[PDB]
Structures are given as structure tokens and as C-alpha cells.
Amino acid sequence: MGCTYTIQPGDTFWAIAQRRGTTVDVIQSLNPGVNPARLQVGQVINVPC
Fold first, then answer.
1. Are 12 and 36 in contact, with CB atoms under 8 Å apart?
2. Among the listed residues 12, 38, 13, the one whose alpha carbon sits nearest the alpha carbon of residue 24
3. Are 7 and 41 in contact (CB under 8 A)?
4. What is the largest CA-CA distance in the chain?
5. Which CA distances in Å does 28 have to 1, 11, 36?
6. Is 44 helix (H, G, I), strand (E, B) or coil?
7. Residue 46 in contact with residue 31, Cβ under 8 Å?
8. Which of 5, 28, 33, 49 would you label with 19, given CA atoms 20 to 30 Å apart?
9. Any idea where the LysM domain is (predicted)?
10. Which fold has domain 1-49?
11. What whole-number distance in Å separates Cα of residue 22 and Cα of residue 42?
12. How many of the other CB atoms lie within 10 Å of CB of 20?
């Protein structure tokens, strides 16, 4: 099912968006139940492929 990514130390939706070639609003839409200010290292999120 699409692609997944594990939150690493220092990650933010902005930084993840930039690596994946997208925007924060798309990362949020793929992870609608995730608070971007409450990430934990080791959490698994959905990302574009």
C-alpha cells in the first residue's frame, strides 16, 4: 500500500515533504490523524512513492 517512512531524529513534515518532492499539506493529508508537532522518532507515516 503505497510507501511508508519511519520518523528519524530531527525530522519534520517540512523536511520529509522536501525529500519526497511534495508539500507539508500533502504529508498531512496522507497522515490525517498525525499531529505534526507531536512526532516521535520511530513512528511510521505514509509518504509519496
1. yes
2. 13
3. yes
4. 26
5. 17, 14, 8
6. strand
7. yes
8. 33
9. 3-47
10. Membrane-bound Lytic Murein Transglycosylase D; Chain A (3.10.350)
11. 21
12. 16
